């Protein structure tokens, strides 16, 4: 372990034509012991999806924080948050403390509904933006999912086919990893509606 | 402060097959945030089918694998010119890493080949001493990226039947050499766009009862 | 706090604190609790360093009591803990961190459904049947997943607890000497005298 | 990276080498440490680079207002708010200035800031890392009162010795000439000065 | 363990089509002081190599003695052996490579980075490192210290990859060496305007030209130039 | 990363290459390098990506300001000083390295800016990982005084040398020309070393490839009366 | 790692985990952390990898030896000191160690000694090792019977490995069992956790927090 | 953590010793043997370092046993207790140091009494008849003496133990499982189950 | 503590401090860093003066048993002895070493042996902690081939420039001078040196 992770957990966002998808496993670990099979990474705002993983506490803390930061901005414009904007939300919220700094490393994934086009974000500690569309992957298993996703990358699958694409990257990569073993949930996003499929899989 | 140890980078892939055998290994050479070499073999032919390569820090996997090629040469002058198996040097390599663990070699040693039955077989290292026979593994620093596709696309773990819910896995496909060869390519490849420590050229060498061949791609120096 | 469990069952929540306060070399007092009520369906126990453990357990406890007056109406358990949880995480970006590590049970009178959370001192809430921290956590969530049934009777619970303390006793060098075991129902909290 | 002021008869004659090396690698080559102060106040610099910038910059926001409110400022004036300002940030901060002016009624004055921060009246200074090469040939071959001539051929020669015995010490030799004829600037190139 | 104490600093070098081109500045660098001026870092073994080492002085010059005694070693033991078993770079090359990787294991290495250039008696360029460390490559292109940052780059465009050495011709080569020795006295605090330079020739051998200087030394942008960046 | 500065008589370019890694690994492949001051202001960014971005932004916001306020053009002389402070204040506990470069009437500047607060000027610059690389291609084959085509090969060259030599420098190389009075040419993909090599066999499979075990529907909107 | 083994009325049972982990990567998951010494003998590979495949190895070497010399089986007494006199003299140099030496003999019967790299000789009847040993214990304790059928010693033994690698971060790989005779062990096979864990979930009514 | 005590009676040596071994932060086995014999009539308790233990104690008993073989009859415990005195003042020069304390408890069949010894850790050999090492001695030199009379027997030296390893068990935060007694007199070495 | 020497046409003078410095404390303000180790060829010591001292006495005795078994020495042949158990004991002794002698037959001639062991022709050398103050101001007034007063004067005035910037240079300034007539001691007091 390191101390900016020790509790893991993995996301992995992906872009096809005109869908978004994201997924995450739902071990929780502490050290060696593995602690609960339910406990969601990705939580969403409206219709923004985010994945936060790291050190376990932030997750937690920057979930409720980031909920009173949409609402507030919701109420007062009388409209929905949008995920090109919602990118350099996060970047500020992480930079406020450089020094003893939120240790996380969030997915941003969403569709806009002002131009139908799939947007995807990475950021590090202190928050950066890393505006590749073409696929972001944070977690402890970064490495291997840098990897995983690239050979199997073709760009703009159907996304029923991407549903395929991302399941498969993230169940291999998770075997390997070794904070996260347990669970996945699995969001294929779409303008229409957004699709939350839970896989079967192997626990440890 | 002298210090022994450094970094010279690589990584290197073995797959075993059904009646063949790959050793592989990008030809790029590092020190720092330069590049030494765009084109130096990390995969070393030694004979009776036996590949080696010791990828890493090449002070240690130069070093062990001069031990192992002298230790052929004595076993043709006393055990009288005999196949010198893969299972058997396995031991032997294990034995000249722990001749000194108390100043440990760091190297990421595969070697590949046939067994005696003919069947594609890998076995590899920990840089200490052990080693245990494997079907896929990546050694080398973008190691972490290449194993995950190794097992769905060879060893087909994670992948199921359609028309079922995906509750009956789809069942094993023997290779091809050609077959190999390809998914090698793959791994290299996708390691050169999201790693940066390989690059320049790759070097397959394949061991089959037909020779041993050399093959050459270039990758990229992005 | 030498050892801490929690096991949730069919109508009840059921938790175990340690007898034992070791400090030094010397445990100065073997028989002394280490949970307080919060509410009286809501009883958190507590386990962590010594002298962060006292002060934190009722602080707490004066401010999840304040809401209760204020409302004059009960703080649900979901409510309950996300406020344990929120205090940790601050503290640990604050001047004086805690080790303070809580299981929070209640039995949830508006969902009419028992609740577990488990809280660890960095601050990590987890809906979990199942918790312990320290390295009691380490030898019997193991054992937990054979013996558990879906569901069982609060005597089963009680059964199922007595056989987490036996294993705990046999591989563990810490001693707690007994627990007190605390039951959270429907109708209170209450005592029951268990070896 | 050794810099020099040297008080002759009508003036003083600041030099300085402009090569700036954060490890082995020059940072840059052709940057001058030839900084105004005021019109016929300038300052040397040496030592950690970003902190006598920062240093040199807050000397001029005085000094600006010294000009405005106080009439202009001696050469004296300018060199206590260097001595100041070190003193004050002693462990944030190490700073070898050297700070030298022309006035009219008084001549050339030079006084070396050390890195500790202190003020020292001196006929000629030699301050930084480049300067512990040079200190033998710069106490012979002065001498009091000079023409003008002489003074930058001492100034050129002293300089062109650091940088056999230095690494830090290269470029080319900048020199700012303070006189009542104005400023001038004055330069040399490597061609030239190794020939010496 | 030890700790260096006067160093050399670079040595660039790549190859040709008849042969390969070594150089390096003269320096004997004491840390902030340029103690000593013309130390030879480029010691000829034999005609047909030269070996050229920066780094450790101390380890330099015990080196120089051992390569000395390898071609008196070389005539030992046979009737003739300076034409008829010739010496090679490979040799040598390997020779350094057992001896300072030992040297490593024992805790006490010798501190140089070596660049091994010459051509064999197949005629064929040799142009390979080696080091304290024990790596050893082969390169088109070769620099060790400082120049393997930032001098190479420039000697890389020259010749890409291994099969673009016939494209160079000797004096192609040594322009672009020139080129790699202007660099390094412009941007190494540890370089110095003084070098020599050695090249190995198959169809000639040996020239090597001692005490050249850079030429073409630009500083006339210089007076133009002004401030730290801002001049009020 | 790479970045590098040419001055040349009408104006400044500023290239930098697209790739950002942090670790070994890479983190985007193509992902700007070039942060937008002022109009006329640009500047590339090296080092921790993080802290480059932000500071650019913060500085960025305040010249925008100052324009407005000056109620004049936004000098790169501004910009600078105003950097350099903020800059000093964190006392190098901030890990910014840029090379800024901009147009303002004063004329043409080129400059480097550390971490610490040391600050320089040349006629050719640059900073980074790939800086020796880049550094060794403008010294040789630049001299003072140059045209608009050849300051933008010479510029492409340095980056193009940086991407081959240097590990945390790859793919492509994005440049920025901005010359005196004339708009900034932001040109997105300039060059290319080296295409991709695509994957040889198909990887979109059917469903049911990857198990499902439940199937639901997340809120994201408010229901009417339907 | 997650190894266990227990003494029982047939044999000794030995079970272990198959996946080694480095640290936040994980090195295989396919390992094998038995040791076939000799037919008779089995060792366990817990603590570091290169330490226990080596010396127990040599372990092999000398088991063969002392049977050439005196025509008589060697003791599983004599055979677990001779490697803790062994691994004491290399005590300090890095050596990690902590294997279980199991074995049946007509003169004995069943014996365990765990065997540490401090240089220690414990008679056990239950012994775990690893990191992953906190939760080995939690099943295998509470459901152990000296008189147990061979049958459902094999059951217990991977009831014991389940929990453990489920609740370990470093073990998974497969549930690799032995029972060992005076006959000596006989290999009882390699079964995927993967699919052995949702059977166990149905049959037994276990793991209730685990939704798929 | 590893109880070893040491009373001399009139008649008798009575040595105890724990049966936890743990080794990590967790007990390795509930139930062992921590005491063995060097002779017929002299018994050697052993605690102290971690796996030092197994091999200190099995070397001291094969000296003791060649000499005995050597003389045809068993040596006196003076020259037992100074023997092993030697072996620790040795280890201490050396670059092994063995970290184990002892007591030495024999039944001198010359002069008529028993004879209790003990050795340091550091190697420090002296003759007390309350002796103990460890976490034990700090509770039990005490302890012992309180109603320890000149004029003693074996039963009123074994009511007196019993209540020291009750005290133990009370104040220290070690779980020792019970202790093994085991009784020296001229009549043999035998074990006698304790609580 | 500086020592160094001058080749000249009829020679080389080795040149001394007198000063034994252990801190900043003087043992000894005499005790002189010129020792004789052979007939012909003095050495200069600087570094620790323990460490140094033990060397020599090494190397002097190689140089006796050379003289008897296979003729006298040289400059060349002296250095080298220095050298190996300098470079073989590079961590356990800290020495640098100038070792200068006459020969008729190549006449003066010196060698300096820095820290850690390396051999260097030199013309002329400059070693201790007060050298690279006086670094440039020899480079300056050093010629070959010059006349014999020129050369003590030069020596002379180098040193008494060493004890004007450099706080452990001092004593008397003492000189060894070889020559093929043997051997002259010179000693110049700071009531004649330091005024110049």
Redesign the interface.
Known sequence: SDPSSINGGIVVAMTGKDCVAIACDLRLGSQSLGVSNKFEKIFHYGHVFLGITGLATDVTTLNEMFRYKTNLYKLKEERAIEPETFTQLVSSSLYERRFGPYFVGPVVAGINSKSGKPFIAGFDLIGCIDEAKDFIVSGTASDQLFGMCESLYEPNLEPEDLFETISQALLNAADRDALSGWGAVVYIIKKDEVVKRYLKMRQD | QFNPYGDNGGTILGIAGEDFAVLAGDTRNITDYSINSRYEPKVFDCGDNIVMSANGFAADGDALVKRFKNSVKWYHFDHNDKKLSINSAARNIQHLLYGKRFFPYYVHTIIAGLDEDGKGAVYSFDPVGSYEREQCRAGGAAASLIMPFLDNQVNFKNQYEPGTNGKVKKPLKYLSVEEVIKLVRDSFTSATERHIQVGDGLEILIVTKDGVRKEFYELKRD | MDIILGIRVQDSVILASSKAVTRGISVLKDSDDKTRQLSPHTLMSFAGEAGDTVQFAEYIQANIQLYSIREDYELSPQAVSSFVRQELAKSIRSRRPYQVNVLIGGYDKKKNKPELYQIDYLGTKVELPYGAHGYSGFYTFSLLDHHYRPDMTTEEGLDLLKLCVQELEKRMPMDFKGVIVKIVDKDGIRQVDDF | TSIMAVTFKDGVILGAD?????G?????????????VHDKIWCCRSG????T??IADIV?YHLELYTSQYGTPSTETAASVFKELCYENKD?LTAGIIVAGYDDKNKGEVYTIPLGGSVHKLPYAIAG?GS??????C??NFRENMSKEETVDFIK??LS??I?????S???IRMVVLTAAGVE?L?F???EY?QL | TQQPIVTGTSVISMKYDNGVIIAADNLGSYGSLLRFNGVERLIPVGDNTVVGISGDISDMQHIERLLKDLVTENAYDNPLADAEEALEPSYIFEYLATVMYQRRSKMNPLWNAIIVAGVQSNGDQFLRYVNLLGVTYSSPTLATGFGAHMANPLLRKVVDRESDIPKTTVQVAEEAIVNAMRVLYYRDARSSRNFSLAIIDKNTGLTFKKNLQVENMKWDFAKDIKGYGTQK | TTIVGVKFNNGVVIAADTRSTQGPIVADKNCAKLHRISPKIWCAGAGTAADTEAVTQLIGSNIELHSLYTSREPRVVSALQMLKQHLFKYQGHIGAYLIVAGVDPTGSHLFSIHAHGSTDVGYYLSLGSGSLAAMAVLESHWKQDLTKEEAIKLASDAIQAGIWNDLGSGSNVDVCVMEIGKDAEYLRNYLTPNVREEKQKSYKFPRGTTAVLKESIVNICDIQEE | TTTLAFRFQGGIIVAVDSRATAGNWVASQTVKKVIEINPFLLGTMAGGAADCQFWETWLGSQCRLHELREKERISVAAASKILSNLVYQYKGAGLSMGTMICGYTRKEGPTIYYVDSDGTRLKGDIFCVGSGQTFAYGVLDSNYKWDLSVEDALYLGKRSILAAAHRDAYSGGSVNLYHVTEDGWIYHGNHDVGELFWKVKEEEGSFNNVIG
């Open positions: 402009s090569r700036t090396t954060t082995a690698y020059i940072a840059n080559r052709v940057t001058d440490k030839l900084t105004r950690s680079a970003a902190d910038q920062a001029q944030n890392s512990t090469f040079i200190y033998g040939y106490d012979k020669h002293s010795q650091a056999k015995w230095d690494g830090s290269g470029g080319v600037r330069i190139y490597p061609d190794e």
